[PDB]
């Protein structure tokens, strides 16, 4: 049954995101495991802020206007 | 003194640019109206939740096809 941070494993990277559930969820890969689980952004933001920031930094797309 | 050297508390990021060759954020500081650029590398460390709030508000999804 245990999934997400409840597995007690360390975050490796975030590989996807969805807000279909009505809240933002990140698909998280874990160190020393081939499993990935959805975790609440609310939880990821504080438990691994730098992992969250790296997910976003890699996905920037730019536009401009005067 | 500019950016974090001004010794103010970050309030929110109001924009960004990569033109310097490195990512930088335009930072609004608490009780001030003069915002200035700070490097993303410094902001990520010194105020990660403020950075995250900025990105989260701009996250969307594109489709294929």
């Amino acid at each position: 049954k245990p999934r997400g941070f409840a597995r007690g494993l360390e975050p490796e990277r975030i590989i996807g995101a969805t807000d279909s559930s009505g809240e933002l969820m990140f698909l998280m890969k874990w160190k020393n495991s081939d499993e990935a689980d959805l975790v609440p952004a609310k939880e990821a933001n504080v438990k691994c802020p730098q992992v969250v920031i790296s997910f976003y930094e890699e996905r920037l797309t730019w536009h401009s206007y005067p | 003194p500019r950016g974090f050297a001004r010794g103010l508390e970050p309030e929110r990021i109001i924009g960004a640019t990569d033109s310097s060759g490195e990512l930088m954020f335009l930072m609004k500081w608490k009780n001030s109206d003069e915002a200035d650029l700070v490097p993303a590398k410094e902001a990520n460390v010194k105020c990660p939740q403020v950075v995250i709030s900025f990105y989260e508000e701009r996250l969307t999804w594109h489709s294929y096809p």
């Binding site: 996905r59 730019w62 536009h63 | 960004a16 990105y55 701009r58 969307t60 489709s63 294929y64």
Partner: peptide
């Protein structure tokens, strides 16, 4: 139409 969505972060490029 079968579709697949991917996350993007949209940023306005500022000056300076």
């Amino acid at each position: 139409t079968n579709v697949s969505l991917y996350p993007v972060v949209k940023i306005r490029r500022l000056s300076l």
